[PDB]
Write a protein that binds this ligand. Structure first.
Ligand SMILES: *[C@@H]1O[C@H](CO)[C@@H](O[C@@H]2O[C@H](CO)[C@@H](O[C@@H]3O[C@H](CO[C@H]4O[C@H](CO)[C@@H](O)[C@H](O)[C@@H]4O)[C@@H](O)[C@H](O)[C@@H]3O)[C@H](O)[C@H]2NC(C)=O)[C@H](O)[C@H]1NC(C)=O
Ligand SMILES: [Ca+2]
Ligand SMILES: [Ca+2]
Ligand SMILES: [Ca+2]
Ligand SMILES: [Ca+2]
Ligand SMILES: [Ca+2]
Ligand SMILES: [Ca+2]
Ligand SMILES: [Ca+2]
Ligand SMILES: [Ca+2]
Ligand SMILES: [Ca+2]
Ligand SMILES: [Ca+2]
Ligand SMILES: [Ca+2]
Ligand SMILES: [Ca+2]
Ligand SMILES: [Ca+2]
Ligand SMILES: [Ca+2]
Ligand SMILES: [Ca+2]
Ligand SMILES: [Ca+2]
Ligand SMILES: [Ca+2]
Ligand SMILES: [Ca+2]
Ligand SMILES: [Ca+2]
Ligand SMILES: [Ca+2]
Ligand SMILES: [Ca+2]
Ligand SMILES: [Ca+2]
Ligand SMILES: [Ca+2]
Ligand SMILES: [Ca+2]
Ligand SMILES: [Ca+2]
Ligand SMILES: [Ca+2]
Ligand SMILES: [Ca+2]
Ligand SMILES: [Ca+2]
Ligand SMILES: [Ca+2]
Ligand SMILES: [Ca+2]
Length: 535
């Protein structure tokens, strides 16, 4: 029998049995349903597919109270085009136009006529390049004309053939070295590297690249706005050249941040609308990003703001190709849900924001009985040769390519460090498939002692904690409401910060739903416990 708890401030909690009381930085507090449950904090219903919408409707009136419109397929976007109560994620005819999904060249825009003049994946009714095949449907400047159609693909009003950065906008067209490649998109804005050689594919060309990075934050010294402090996120509030992590007045208003109250907005006076410790222009907006602290994913970082994965770099881990099918990625739920539909070569979707200390949670689900291969997530991504990966494989299996070596994979969660000395290729590939260490490639920092694969159409919630400063790594897995695997504190210092993403390898129809990341440098307690308990 469980009883009513008190909030973190000691006031009596008034949350649901299956909700926690959290207090925000302004000493207000709110309830959140615990993993396996959904609603506001006060009403919690069971959440079967771990996606934030409950199996039954609830009496409160916020999105998360209305009944999940795909009870078992995770769909945090809750998308329902034809608004018929069946979610796109599990409605036989998503747009209700007669043509069932599998046979509909435009599954979400209605088009019984099924016209498709170029014969690419997409019907005319929803193809941003009518007479030009282009299944990936890239529209870099969000204009309507896909790239394959666009005479100004990046929308900077400079024509493509007359644009020295034909894809990265730059109306000033500055090329500060004449290599022909414009500053806005030259991997080397200082040195002529017309050929653009980038041997390691870290996106620093050769005439630039030093491969010197002493703090391990994934930034070249030559190019690290704060060389000795791991600061992968690279913030520099004032723009004064030196990043916050070493800078002594990150905003510049004369007050040292050693003793300042609006550390990130100019406030030379330390003046207030109230006496409470915080200042003024930064009251409930520490970083004045005009996004209130409570909702701000990186409450003291001006450019990051909201968990958002729709801007993502795509990495391919065996570029030669074995299947020569590339994973293909769909984002949904406003950048808070990723989906991968192919039975593909290895690959990573990786978001553009980087982090120091970070918390990252998602729901892993493989929406299909078919295959039994690998899915996972990525944190501390620095480049295609340096990152941390968590992968899981349904079925024990020896990889079919016996070259370059025999890679055998086991069921059951793996934590791996990837520091490849070769990069995307044959080696890294078998290295990633193999459950164990590969001499110049991968180290298996942790594996789940259960040795249990993921179940077909089942939904698991993951919670990562990374603290690059102290090399702290810790991952938890929940199946339904119950915790099922815990790595414990894994100390490892290979990439001291990086970017977040997802990984897949040979597995069609994975959903990563209800994705959340946030800034967190406050180091977990059981770190010093771990450190002390060397007795
Ligand atoms: C950023 O990271 C910080 C550390 O990793 C996070 O701070 C931690 O916040 C939690 C608050 O939940 C504190 O942990 C404990 O909370 C429990 C809650 O009771 C329930 O859980 C316990 C197991 O702890 C279980 O036994 C019970 O049955 C309950 O179901 C309390 O019982 C404890 O007193 C304890 O406070 C950590 O102490 C706190 N650590 C630190 C170092 O601050 C922080 O919240 C993260 N911030 C984010 C995501 O914004
Ligand atoms: Ca009470
Ligand atoms: Ca649900
Ligand atoms: Ca659902
Ligand atoms: Ca529908
Ligand atoms: Ca329908
Ligand atoms: Ca249809
Ligand atoms: Ca249609
Ligand atoms: Ca077409
Ligand atoms: Ca087309
Ligand atoms: Ca375009
Ligand atoms: Ca252009
Ligand atoms: Ca355009
Ligand atoms: Ca351009
Ligand atoms: Ca240049
Ligand atoms: Ca150059
Ligand atoms: Ca390079
Ligand atoms: Ca490099
Ligand atoms: Ca560095
Ligand atoms: Ca640094
Ligand atoms: Ca600065
Ligand atoms: Ca500072
Ligand atoms: Ca400064
Ligand atoms: Ca200051
Ligand atoms: Ca200030
Ligand atoms: Ca104040
Ligand atoms: Ca803010
Ligand atoms: Ca922010
Ligand atoms: Ca299967
Ligand atoms: Ca297989
Ligand atoms: Ca496969």
């Amino acid at each position: 029998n469980s009883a009513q708890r008190f909030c973190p401030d000691g006031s009596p909690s008034e949350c649901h049995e299956h909700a926690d009381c959290v207090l925000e930085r302004d000493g207000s507090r709110s309830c959140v349903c615990a993993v396996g449950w959904a609603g506001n904090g006060i009403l919690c219903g069971r959440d079967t597919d771990l996606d934030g919408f409950p199996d039954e409707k609830l009496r409160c009136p916020e999105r998360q109270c209305r009944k999940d419109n795909c009870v078992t397929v995770p769909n945090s976007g809750q998308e329902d085009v034809d608004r018929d109560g069946i979610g796109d994620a599990c409605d036989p005819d998503a747009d209700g136009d007669g043509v069932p999904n599998e046979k509909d060249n435009c599954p979400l825009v209605r088009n019984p006529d099924q016209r498709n003049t170029d014969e690419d994946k997409w019907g005319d009714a929803c193809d941003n390049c009518r007479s030009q095949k282009n299944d990936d449907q890239k529209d870099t400047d969000q204009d309507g004309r896909g790239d394959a159609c666009d005479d100004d693909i990046d929308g900077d009003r400079i024509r493509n053939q007359a644009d020295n950065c034909p894809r990265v906008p730059n109306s000033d067209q500055k090329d500060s070295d004449g290599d022909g490649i414009g500053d806005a998109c030259d991997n080397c804005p200082q040195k002529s590297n017309p050929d653009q050689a980038d041997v390691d594919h870290d996106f620093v060309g050769d005439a630039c690249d030093s491969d010197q990075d002493q703090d391990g934050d994934g930034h070249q010294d030559s190019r690290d706005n704060c060389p000795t402090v791991p600061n992968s996120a690279q913030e520099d509030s004032d723009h004064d050249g030196q990043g916050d992590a070493c800078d002594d007045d990150d905003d510049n208003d004369g007050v040292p941040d050693s003793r300042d109250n609006c550390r990130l907005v100019p406030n030379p006076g330390q003046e207030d609308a109230d006496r409470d410790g915080v200042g003024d222009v930064c009251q409930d907006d520490f970083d004045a990003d005009k996004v209130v602290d409570k909702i701000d994913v990186c409450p003291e970082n001006a450019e990051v703001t909201l968990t958002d994965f729709r801007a993502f770099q795509t990495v391919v881990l065996d570029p030669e190709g074995d299947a020569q099918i590339d994973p293909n990625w769909v984002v949904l739920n406003q950048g808070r849900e990723i989906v991968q539909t192919m039975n593909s070569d290895p690959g990573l979707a990786v978001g553009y924001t980087a982090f120091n200390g970070v918390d990252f949670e998602g729901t892993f689900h493989v929406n299909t009985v078919t295959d039994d291969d690998y899915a996972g997530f990525i944190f501390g991504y620095q480049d295609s040769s340096s990152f941390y990966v968590v992968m899981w494989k349904q079925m024990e299996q020896t990889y079919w390519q016996a070259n370059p070596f025999r890679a055998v994979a086991e069921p059951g969660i793996q934590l791996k460090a990837v520091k490849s000395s070769t990069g995307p290729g044959e080696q890294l590939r078998n290295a990633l498939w193999h459950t164990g260490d590969t001499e110049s490639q991968v180290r298996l920092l942790w594996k789940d002692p259960r040795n249990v694969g993921w179940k077909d159409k089942k939904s698991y919630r993951w919670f990562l904690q990374h603290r690059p400063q102290v090399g702290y790594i810790r991952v938890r897995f929940y199946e339904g409401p119950e915790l099922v695997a815990d790595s414990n504190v894994v100390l490892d210092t290979t990439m001291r910060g990086g970017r977040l993403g997802v990984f897949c390898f040979s597995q069609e129809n994975i959903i990563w739903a209800n994705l959340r990341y946030r800034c967190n440098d406050t180091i977990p307690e059981d770190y010093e416990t771990h450190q002390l308990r060397q007795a």
